[PDB]
Amino acid sequence: MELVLKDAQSALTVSETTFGRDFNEALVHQVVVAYAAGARQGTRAQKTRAEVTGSGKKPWRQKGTGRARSGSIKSPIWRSGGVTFAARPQDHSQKVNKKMYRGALKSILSELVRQDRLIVVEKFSVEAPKTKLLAQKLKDMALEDVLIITGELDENLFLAARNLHKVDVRDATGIDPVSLIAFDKVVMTADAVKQVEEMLA
Amino acid sequence: ARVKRGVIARARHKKILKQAKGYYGARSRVYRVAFQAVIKAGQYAYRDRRQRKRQFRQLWIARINAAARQNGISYSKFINGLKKASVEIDRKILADIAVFDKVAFTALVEKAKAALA
Amino acid sequence: PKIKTVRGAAKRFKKTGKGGFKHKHANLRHILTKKATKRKRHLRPKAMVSKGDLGLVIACLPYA
Amino acid sequence: RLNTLSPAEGSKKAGKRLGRGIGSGLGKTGGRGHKGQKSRSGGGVRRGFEGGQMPLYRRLPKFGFTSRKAAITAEIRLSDLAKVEGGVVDLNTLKAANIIGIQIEFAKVILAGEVTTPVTVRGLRVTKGARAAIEAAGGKIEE
RNA sequence: UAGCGGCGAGCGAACGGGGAGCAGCCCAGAGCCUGAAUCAGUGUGUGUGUUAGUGGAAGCGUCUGGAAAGGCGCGCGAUACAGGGUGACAGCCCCGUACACAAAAAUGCACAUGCUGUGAGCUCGAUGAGUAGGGCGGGACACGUGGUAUCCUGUCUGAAUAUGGGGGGACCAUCCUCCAAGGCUAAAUACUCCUGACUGACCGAUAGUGAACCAGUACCGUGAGGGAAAGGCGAAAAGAACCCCGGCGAGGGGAGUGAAAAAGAACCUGAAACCGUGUACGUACAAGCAGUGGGAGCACGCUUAGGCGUGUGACUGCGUACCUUUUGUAUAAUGGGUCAGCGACUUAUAUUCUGUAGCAAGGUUAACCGAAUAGGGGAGCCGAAGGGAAACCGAGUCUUAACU
């Protein structure tokens, strides 16, 4: 399969298994839900009846008051009392199999090619580390919301995209499913395309 | 994610208490009694969608029996007569003619006595 | 945790090729001279655990 | 399109929530019947408990012993040994190919399917059928 | 898992493998030789960090509005669109943020260096005795005295000491390995009274700390100890000058501020129970889960009278609450005065089955390294082969002298 370059008007020869397969929506959904679940810092705790600051003195005698029977002032039925199934800090990571992660990336890349959301430029670098220059450059290429991905992480490009909200610059190594799906257009350097095919075999 | 449950509980209680307007005392004010009142009203309403068919039929039979005995025949003999005369007018309509149109009812009694003899 | 085997059940049942469990027959340890040799000869080979009891055995032996 | 991805059909089943209402099906008793030891929190009897009758794992005699030596014997198919990288098979050359394990001292070359290349088996026991199958597809067995 | 186990309930290894980290030395002792590496204690110098800080971009017009950061129109900054405030939602109003700098003094760490102490290295010798082991009692080892190795010792004893001794799970022999009865030693590791920065599919005032508020307080108890409730006017107090009733009151009515005082300090919103005032209808000869089906009349709205809608409801058929527990409850069996808020199948880790997704005779990694949800890492686990108590055999195997 060939990818038409935007500026050089060449065609980059790619794998049909990586950039031309089907969209497995179930697989992609599992890897997306799992990625987002991996981001949860699961930090919280409520106090069970054991950890509430009280005493284990029984508040009234078992029998003879006409009150209902009670044994602790830290019961979960009592106000001020201790959550019944109080939470603990927990890990929310899911295992994604490696072939399911790579499969999901192959599906989403194939759909970015198929929906014309994938732009392949030969070079994409900025002159000076200025956000003005990258803003003008993306304005000239009719791109507002964009994921620039470059095979060699330029310093000046990284500093130029750090203030722009919609724009994100990645290396070809650190792409994730949720950003290929999140951003409207993905602009890959040709070197990044080659590195992606080396990653995804 | 703690979920407070004030707003939706208020909506359910209010739904039930709107369905109990007009009830005496707590039956229209207190939720815990208006819930039972609303349900028991539901069961009665079901039961009485069947009984209104039974009650209306016995009303109609009493009116046809009255008007037919006014024309000198009982209800039993009148319905037998009209069935043998092959008249298929149901008894809502025979009750309604028997109130509003005395002459038509007289003629129906003549068909019944004509076929019954 | 990790599920502990009911340990005295592992000494008594052994897993077979299609998931059933074999066991040694009861009644052949002592008092023996009163028994016919036909009983004793039919109690020597090992036997499969019946349908009723596989639930219990699988519960006691979760790794075998 | 993260608001258009969707799971498969049948993959996410709901989850029983017990104790909520009459319509749900599992309210009041949550699916655990009337009183008893099993309808109680924590309630249940232990494994292999038949009331007090002597349990099955305890009215049947115990047999046997564990070998110590069967834990260091292995059992090699013929589907492998095209995997050994060499065309020569010893205990190492199998350990190196991640196929028996480090603790293994004894190995055996059971007929379990389709040797093709000529293989020289060294120092391993070979079954009868698989001796014929190794020697039939070129092959060599010395010991 | 092997094992231990009223062989019950349960307890539960090591070998070996993969990683994190890695570091070796000294005395029992003389001579040669000296300050030789070594650290320790201090001075000084350098570097860096902490304890105050400094600079820090870029906007106006118009419409709604009490007020603009909002709408609309046109500009500018960005290595700065983290965040907070500002009269509603601000990149450009303010404090900041990115970034670049700053220490008279006191310090932490790391090099360098001065002094003191300390000892390198070589040859030769020595190489831990009431000790190892034993008997009795007990304990620790996964191992409950058992066939029980090993370690510890309360009691009684008691060696050999490199042509020697310990171990190799009763025990003996052969072989292998190691040197007890003296001691020091970084890193990987565990924890958070306390400080700083940041983060949360954590809570938001009956929650979150017991404690958002002068809370371990009030209060209770002789005492140890127990232990509350209680947040929110407004953008800004501009928090109500003055007049009238009133007891130089309380409370109110005007006036005034305010966008708004049914935003007035008993202050955002302002529910329900509960209590009233006003209007329509019914109700003083009528018996009961108080409704429901029918239903006249009356009062309000309609309505080209269309004969409907809302409220009430005479009279009439039928009709003994809900829960729970039960063979069976109107039951005179249990529970509930009512409202409002909270209040009960969860979480973790293993195992099995079903659905679904990936790969498929293969599937998959764990710890960890980490450009760090990637990629490495296949140690391992599960499956492709069973039979047998086991050796062993193997698409067969076990039984048996052998099997129709």
Curated annotation (Swiss-Prot), chain A:
GO cellular component: cytoplasm; cytosol; cytosolic large ribosomal subunit; large ribosomal subunit
Stored InterPro entries: Ribosomal_uL4 (IPR002136), Ribosomal_uL4-like (IPR013005), Ribosomal_uL4_dom_sf (IPR023574)
Disordered: annotated segments: 44-71
Keywords on record: Antibiotic resistance, Repressor, Ribonucleoprotein, Ribosomal protein, RNA-binding, rRNA-binding, Transcription, Transcription regulation, Transcription termination, Translation regulation
SUPFAM superfamilies membership: Ribosomal protein L4
Secretion signal span: none
One GO MF term: rRNA binding
Top-level taxon of the source organism: Bacteria
GO BP: any one term: response to antibiotic
Remaining remarks: The erythromycin sensitive allele is dominant over the resistant allele.
Self-association and partners: Part of the 50S ribosomal subunit. In TnaC-stalled ribosomes forms part of the binding pocket for L-Trp with the leader peptide and uL22.
Function: One of the primary rRNA binding proteins, this protein initially binds near the 5'-end of the 23S rRNA. It is important during the early stages of 50S assembly. It makes multiple contacts with different domains of the 23S rRNA in the assembled 50S subunit and ribosome.
Family: Belongs to the universal ribosomal protein uL4 family.
Protein's name in the database: Large ribosomal subunit protein uL4
Gene responsible for this protein: rplD
UniProtKB/Swiss-Prot annotation, chain B:
GO biological process: cytoplasmic translation; ribosomal large subunit assembly
Keywords: Ribonucleoprotein, Ribosomal protein, RNA-binding, rRNA-binding
PROSITE patterns linked to this entry: RIBOSOMAL_L20 (PS00937)
InterPro entries hit by this protein: Ribosomal_bL20, RIBOSOMAL_L20_CS, Ribosomal_protein_bL20_C
Single annotated GO MF: large ribosomal subunit rRNA binding
SUPFAM superfamilies from the UniProt entry: Ribosomal protein L20 (SSF74731)
One term under GO cellular component: cytosol
Family recorded in the similarity comment: Belongs to the bacterial ribosomal protein bL20 family.
Role played: One of the primary rRNA binding proteins, it binds close to the 5'-end of the 23S rRNA. It is important during the early stages of 50S assembly.
Oligomeric and partner information: Part of the 50S ribosomal subunit. Contacts L21.
Name of the protein: Large ribosomal subunit protein bL20
Source organism per UniProt: Escherichia coli (strain K12)
From Swiss-Prot, chain D:
GO molecular function: rRNA binding; structural constituent of ribosome
Region called Disordered, residue ranges: 1-53
Keyword Ribosomal protein: yes
Keyword rRNA-binding (UniProt): yes
Family annotation (Pfam families): Ribosomal_L27A
GO cellular component: cytoplasm; cytosolic large ribosomal subunit
Alphabetic keyword roster: Ribonucleoprotein, Ribosomal protein, RNA-binding, rRNA-binding
Taxonomy, superkingdom: Bacteria
GO biological process: cytoplasmic translation
Protein role: This protein binds the 5S rRNA. It is required for the late stages of subunit assembly, and is essential for 5S rRNA assembly onto the ribosome.
Subunit text: Part of the 50S ribosomal subunit. Contacts the 5S rRNA.
Family the UniProt entry places it in: Belongs to the universal ribosomal protein uL15 family.
Protein name in the entry: Large ribosomal subunit protein uL15
Organism of derivation: Escherichia coli (strain K12)
Upper taxonomic lineage: Bacteria, Pseudomonadati, Pseudomonadota, Gammaproteobacteria, Enterobacterales
Protein encoded by which gene: rplO
